[PDB]
Symmetry: C2
Subunit: 215 residues, 2 copies
């Protein structure tokens, strides 16, 4: 935990394929790990402009960036020194499916985030048609299973016309060194936003762990 | 909404079958709809003592019993006069599956709740073996879809040994009369507890709607 500081920097590299379209995205960011806030700037360097919704990738671009209250142990910040990895399965309501993997390491004051994602979607999918309008704020259920954290989120995309599109996130987050203070089950409230301008993309996330309303 | 009062009474009748075992459960309760609190007493009148975990049935035994803040419309209390129904699919991590249906009507100060449930579980399931130890407090994601509320909850059962067992709840709640003030997407925090003594069973639920932490 001590190597996780109040202000940190981040670098990102992603390789992926969606419906056969290969792409590469890279960038950097800054954030406040203990406040649960960070911002990122990215560039699509291969396969741009992306022909599918960036919302599919935004949550792939680090649970160390979460505000944790004193009464809930912070598994993620305890992952350093050591590093950790995570894998998220995305199950969309129309049958769309994607799996993303990330490895997060630390050198100095910089988190190095390397990820990959593979996805397949029907042609009618609002992800395939690049027509989703962001994720609604969400609540991820956190549990512990064999020394790993498991996260379950019923995520929803906003659509043109006011409707929504469900995507289940099923994630396993795993330290590379045994975590000594495992938390009780809890929730993480999220609010992520992203903006795409051509091949330049911005992302920001606020995340707070809690046990509201019963604490 | 006006027929939903600060203190109300409840009656319950349930018919079901789990792994071929048919049963009937009946009882009554009292609660405070606007405070999001209620308590229930039940008796297994056919097929008792139940050979499977009562946790499978506890959430089947009424979203009108939820505390709603002023800034989030209360779809459920707007269902009266009129009544509503709901259907919940339960998907357990070992392949166990159940579907429950309920219809809720009102006469005077009494909610009449009639439900059915069908479930199939592998013999090794902690539900089939009647060895789960209650649900952890949860957060249900609420969205609106074509005049109905949809609820998604990543529910977890506590097990002997400290582990947990996941069950996805996918529920559709639907008024019998068009609801005039539909809510924005939101969360409902739950804490349900039940106690089984032979064929006598007690249940209590606290539920609060919210948009924490970002409101």
């Amino acid at each position: 935990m001590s190597v996780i500081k109040p202000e940190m920097k981040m670098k990102y590299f992603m390789d992926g394929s969606v419906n056969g379209h290969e792409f590469t995205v890279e960038g950097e960011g800054t954030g406040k790990p203990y406040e649960g806030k960070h911002k990122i700037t990215l560039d699509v360097t291969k396969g741009g402009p992306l022909p599918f919704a960036f919302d599919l990738l935004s949550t792939v671009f680090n649970r160390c960036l979460t505000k944790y209250p004193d009464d809930i142990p912070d598994y993620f910040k305890q992952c350093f020194p050591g590093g950790y990895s995570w894998e998220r399965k995305f199950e969309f309501e129309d049958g769309g499916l994607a799996i993303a993997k990330a490895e997060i390491s630390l050198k100095g004051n910089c988190f190095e985030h390397k990820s990959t994602i593979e996805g397949t979607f029907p042609d009618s999918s609002p992800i395939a048609q690049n027509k989703t309008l962001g994720w609604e704020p969400s609540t991820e259920k956190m549990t512990v299973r064999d020394g790993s954290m498991k996260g379950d989120d019923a995520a929803y995309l906003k659509l043109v016309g006011g409707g929504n599109h469900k995507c289940y996130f099923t994630t396993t987050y795993t330290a590379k060194k045994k975590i000594p203070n495992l938390p009780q089950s809890h929730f993480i409230g999220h609010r992520i936003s992203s903006v795409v301008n051509g091949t330049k993309i911005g992302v920001m996330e606020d995340a707070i762990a809690h046990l509201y309303p019963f604490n």
